[PDB]
Amino acid sequence: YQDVNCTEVPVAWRVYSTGSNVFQTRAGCLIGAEHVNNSYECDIPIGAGICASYQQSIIAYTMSLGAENSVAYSNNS
Amino acid sequence: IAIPTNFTISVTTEILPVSMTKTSVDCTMYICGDSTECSNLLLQYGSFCTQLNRALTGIAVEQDKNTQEVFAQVKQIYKTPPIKDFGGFNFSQILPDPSKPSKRSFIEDLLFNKVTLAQKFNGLTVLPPLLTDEMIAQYTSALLAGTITSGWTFGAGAALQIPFAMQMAYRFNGIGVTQNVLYENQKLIANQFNSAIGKIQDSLSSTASALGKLQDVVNQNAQALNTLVKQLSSNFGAISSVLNDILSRLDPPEAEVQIDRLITGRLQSLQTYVTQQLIRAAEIRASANLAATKMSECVLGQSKRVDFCGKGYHLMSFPQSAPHGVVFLHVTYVPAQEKNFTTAPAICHDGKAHFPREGVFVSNGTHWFVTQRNFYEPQIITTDNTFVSGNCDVVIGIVNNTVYDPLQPELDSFK
Amino acid sequence: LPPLLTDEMIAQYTSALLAGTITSGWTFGAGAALQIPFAMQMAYRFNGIGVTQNVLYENQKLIANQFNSAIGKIQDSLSSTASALGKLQDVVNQNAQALN
Amino acid sequence: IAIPTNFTISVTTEILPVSMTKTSVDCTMYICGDSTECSNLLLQYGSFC
Amino acid sequence: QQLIRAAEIRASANLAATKMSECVLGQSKRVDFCGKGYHLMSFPQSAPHG
Amino acid sequence: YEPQIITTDNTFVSGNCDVVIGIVNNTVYDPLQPELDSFK
Ligand SMILES: *[C@@H]1O[C@H](CO)[C@@H](O)[C@H](O[C@@H]2O[C@H](CO)[C@@H](O)[C@H](O)[C@H]2NC(C)=O)[C@H]1NC(C)=O
Ligand SMILES: *[C@@H]1O[C@H](CO)[C@@H](O[C@@H]2O[C@H](CO)[C@@H](O)[C@H](O)[C@H]2NC(C)=O)[C@H](O)[C@H]1NC(C)=O
Ligand SMILES: *[C@@H]1O[C@H](CO)[C@@H](O[C@@H]2O[C@H](CO)[C@@H](O)[C@H](O)[C@H]2NC(C)=O)[C@H](O)[C@H]1NC(C)=O
Ligand SMILES: *[C@@H]1O[C@H](CO)[C@@H](O[C@@H]2O[C@H](CO)[C@@H](O)[C@H](O)[C@H]2NC(C)=O)[C@H](O)[C@H]1NC(C)=O
Ligand SMILES: *[C@@H]1O[C@H](CO)[C@@H](O[C@@H]2O[C@H](CO)[C@@H](O)[C@H](O)[C@H]2NC(C)=O)[C@H](O)[C@H]1NC(C)=O
Ligand SMILES: *[C@@H]1O[C@H](CO)[C@@H](O[C@@H]2O[C@H](CO)[C@@H](O)[C@H](O)[C@H]2NC(C)=O)[C@H](O)[C@H]1NC(C)=O
Ligand SMILES: *[C@@H]1O[C@H](CO)[C@@H](O)[C@H](O)[C@H]1NC(C)=O
Ligand SMILES: *[C@@H]1O[C@H](CO)[C@@H](O)[C@H](O)[C@H]1NC(C)=O
Ligand SMILES: *[C@@H]1O[C@H](CO)[C@@H](O)[C@H](O)[C@H]1NC(C)=O
Ligand SMILES: *[C@@H]1O[C@H](CO)[C@@H](O)[C@H](O)[C@H]1NC(C)=O
Ligand SMILES: *[C@@H]1O[C@H](CO)[C@@H](O)[C@H](O)[C@H]1NC(C)=O
Numbered sequence: 001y002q003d004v005n006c007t008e009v010p011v012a013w014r015v016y017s018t019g020s021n022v023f024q025t026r027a028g029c030l031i032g033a034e035h036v037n038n039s040y041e042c043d044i045p046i047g048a049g050i051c052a053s054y055q056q057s058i059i060a061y062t063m064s065l066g067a068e069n070s071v072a073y074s075n076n077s
Numbered sequence: 078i079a080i081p082t083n084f085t086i087s088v089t090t091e092i093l094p095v096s097m098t099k100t101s102v103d104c105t106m107y108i109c110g111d112s113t114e115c116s117n118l119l120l121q122y123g124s125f126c127t128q129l130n131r132a133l134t135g136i137a138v139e140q141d142k143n144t145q146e147v148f149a150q151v152k153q154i155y156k157t158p159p160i161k162d163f164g165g166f167n168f169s170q171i172l173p174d175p176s177k178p179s180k181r182s183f184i185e186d187l188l189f190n191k192v193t194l195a196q197k198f199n200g201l202t203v204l205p206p207l208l209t210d211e212m213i214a215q216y217t218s219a220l221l222a223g224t225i226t227s228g229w230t231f232g233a234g235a236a237l238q239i240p241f242a243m244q245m246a247y248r249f250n251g252i253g254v255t256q257n258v259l260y261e262n263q264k265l266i267a268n269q270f271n272s273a274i275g276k277i278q279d280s281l282s283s284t285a286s287a288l289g290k291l292q293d294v295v296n297q298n299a300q301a302l303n304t305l306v307k308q309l310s311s312n313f314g315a316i317s318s319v320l321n322d323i324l325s326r327l328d329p330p331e332a333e334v335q336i337d338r339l340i341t342g343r344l345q346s347l348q349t350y351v352t353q354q355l356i357r358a359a360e361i362r363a364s365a366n367l368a369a370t371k372m373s374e375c376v377l378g379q380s381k382r383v384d385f386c387g388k389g390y391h392l393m394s395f396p397q398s399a400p401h402g403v404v405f406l407h408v409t410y411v412p413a414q415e416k417n418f419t420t421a422p423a424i425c426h427d428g429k430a431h432f433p434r435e436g437v438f439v440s441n442g443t444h445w446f447v448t449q450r451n452f453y454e455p456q457i458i459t460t461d462n463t464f465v466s467g468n469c470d471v472v473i474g475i476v477n478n479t480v481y482d483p484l485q486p487e488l489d490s491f492k
Numbered sequence: 493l494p495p496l497l498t499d500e501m502i503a504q505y506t507s508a509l510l511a512g513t514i515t516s517g518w519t520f521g522a523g524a525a526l527q528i529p530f531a532m533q534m535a536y537r538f539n540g541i542g543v544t545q546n547v548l549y550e551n552q553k554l555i556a557n558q559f560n561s562a563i564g565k566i567q568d569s570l571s572s573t574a575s576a577l578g579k580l581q582d583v584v585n586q587n588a589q590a591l592n
Numbered sequence: 593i594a595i596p597t598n599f600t601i602s603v604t605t606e607i608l609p610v611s612m613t614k615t616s617v618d619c620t621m622y623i624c625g626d627s628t629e630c631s632n633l634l635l636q637y638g639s640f641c
Numbered sequence: 642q643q644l645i646r647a648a649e650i651r652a653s654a655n656l657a658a659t660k661m662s663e664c665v666l667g668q669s670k671r672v673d674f675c676g677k678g679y680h681l682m683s684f685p686q687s688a689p690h691g
Numbered sequence: 692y693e694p695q696i697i698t699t700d701n702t703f704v705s706g707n708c709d710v711v712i713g714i715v716n717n718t719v720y721d722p723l724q725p726e727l728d729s730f731k
Pocket of ligand 2: 082083084265268269
């Protein structure tokens, strides 16, 4: 539900509005997905850096830009 | 002929818009606004609102496509080493600064502070971008780290290390200047680069009108939206611009006419807004394509195209992020302090004509030398830097001189 | 409305560009203009395409004659042809037609 | 292999448009024309012009 | 219609500026960008609107 | 990667050993010396 508090969602199908898995993003209120602490490549763009995917059930995560890498810089290598 | 005897290093800035705010308008909420009579009358017009919504949604998706095309050009997230020994070059003002909030740099903070200037309305929504500003800053940081640590190798395959001075020697060799000029003038070149970088922030700190294009785009979008909102207080020939007054003060059968009169005008306003939005989006897409080409061809490599990246001979380029666009800092080489000499196309010796392998013949008035074409560095005309072809009675402009043979002294003294 | 730059100013710009490229080469596009004899500049340009300098210097008269003949042919082509401008006219037509 | 033994110098023409005529139109003179009643009626249509 | 046509005219002007910069002020290695064959040089002339 | 021996044919000389920063001491082979020793 775009740009709306998760509080007044059910006031204005009825199982997809209950407070089982309710997440407050910056694009709106998301109901039906579990918020994990991991990061993967984006699958379905939700917005403001939040993506969603299917992995069992549906999960919502923060996008990861790529794999870290430090180059072995030296002044004579 | 005229040949330069010194040079300067110049850094210049270029500004390019890449994205545009994603807006959405609900057709029925804008036209009718909580009135069942208006909605039932508007049902008679077919599927105009579906077309308008589809057009706006396409415009909205195109912006994220533009940003992804321009910035997401690096496979991994590269980092700079904790120790910074780059041969005297100082990148402190463009590398990320982590004491302060966010991972922005000094110049990026100046750019974001400089560009500064709606609300919730009847049917108007603004959608957030897919990539936040931190992720764009992190892309730019990765690109800078890669180009400083590996050169142009990370744009083709895996990144390979190289000391910075050797990389810049490569880059001098790529514009027609030998490696001598760099290693013998390293401190001066580093000082010139540092001074130019320091001047960039002064130029874009006090002066504000440099970021004209970004503010122009923002102002145009705001003005269009404001005009669309203000068009809701016109009666278009009806008795009033409010549907409640029309419904209360008149019964339906002759309220139909006034409602239709309002509906036609509001449809026309929405259509003109959507059409101008489509045209502006096409222009922004062209700009973003140009910006992506510049990032691919000037940050990830060295460009031979004239004036494509700065004025002069392109050495290298660095990217920075702006509110809704990108900034390129182009480092180029500019020859200076020219001197004036006399030339000849070939030299006749022993009845044969000699041409220079990679330079030009010059003379200071009495004696003849061979030099580079872009820097004065005279040398003795020997048989190792010239090649012979034909006799010397066919070329126009032949002058007489002697060509040194290095092997003659060694096979005369030692026989 | 009349354009800001008149035709004489555009002709002046074109003449300046032409003189700069004839007298300096490509040096005036980077910094100050550096003079160079024309034949040596053409030798540079032959090196730029993978042909050595002696090829230019030993066939200078023939190359000059061919260039002069081509320049002569281009003006005869422009004058004799009925309609060679094409696109430039086309744009104009469109605008006028819409206005009508 | 085939290798050339002579050459030719060729001059070619390219033509490109760069601008078009700057034309200006105003509504009130076009739509109504020196008429107060028509302009007063047109004022009810907002800010199209 | 006028706006849609002006966009195309602007694209042509951008291409002309690129050719002026890369073929009159330099020697170009891009194939068929300036003529057919191996590019040597280029000269500009003015036209009533081009 | 295709290493070669450092000779005077694949290098060029210019300047002293003071101005450049990361100089390393080594030897540059001369192809003329063996035949000049074998043929006076
Ligand atoms: C290289 O070889 C020269 C002579 O064959 C020799 O002098 C260098 O030793 C040191 O080089 C330093 C240059 O940075 C110089 O400052 C120092 O005085 C010198 N030592 C002596 C005893 O002369 C050789 N270089 C190295 C690194 O061994
Ligand atoms: C090339 O130009 C540089 C200037 O960028 C000259 O360096 C300056 O020289 C003057 C006089 O010796 C000093 O007062 C300045 O402090 C120098 N500037 C810097 C940044 O070091 C340099 O001398 C010139 N080269 C030649 C051969 O004239
Ligand atoms: C690179 O330049 C920055 C300035 O742009 C240098 O930082 C300054 O360092 C001096 C001496 O340590 C301080 O007094 C200043 O307060 C610093 N300025 C800022 C803005 O931090 C930095 O030292 C330079 N890099 C090197 C290696 O010298
Ligand atoms: C042109 O350059 C040559 C070589 O640098 C100059 O010849 C030298 O002149 C100085 C001063 O008279 C002598 O000490 C050297 O022995 C000369 N070198 C020679 C002859 O090989 C010559 O003077 C310069 N001509 C000018 C500047 O007009
Ligand atoms: C360049 O060298 C040629 C060859 O020596 C000169 O031509 C000779 O000039 C002398 C006089 O100095 C005559 O006696 C000879 O008959 C000429 N020809 C030959 C084959 O020796 C020539 O004069 C010199 N100078 C120039 C400007 O070409
Ligand atoms: C290369 O082509 C040129 C141009 O055709 C040849 O020059 C012509 O030669 C013939 C016969 O000698 C003359 O009748 C023409 O007048 C020449 N043309 C010009 C423009 O001078 C040249 O001979 C050719 N080179 C070869 C075949 O080696
Ligand atoms: C609604 O969402 C905003 C944004 O997170 C939050 O600050 C606020 O506490 C929420 N609740 C209300 C009643 O505004
Ligand atoms: C994610 O980690 C934070 C602490 O950084 C914690 O507060 C939060 O509960 C975690 N979320 C889940 C789903 O475990
Ligand atoms: C040599 O070139 C200089 C420009 O650096 C010029 O001022 C001078 O007049 C020239 N010498 C001549 C024309 O004799
Ligand atoms: C250059 O021009 C002069 C005339 O000032 C002439 O005497 C000389 O022969 C010419 N040299 C060449 C190589 O064309
Ligand atoms: C590399 O850095 C180290 C540490 O500062 C220094 O001792 C060494 O001389 C440097 N080498 C070169 C080639 O600059």
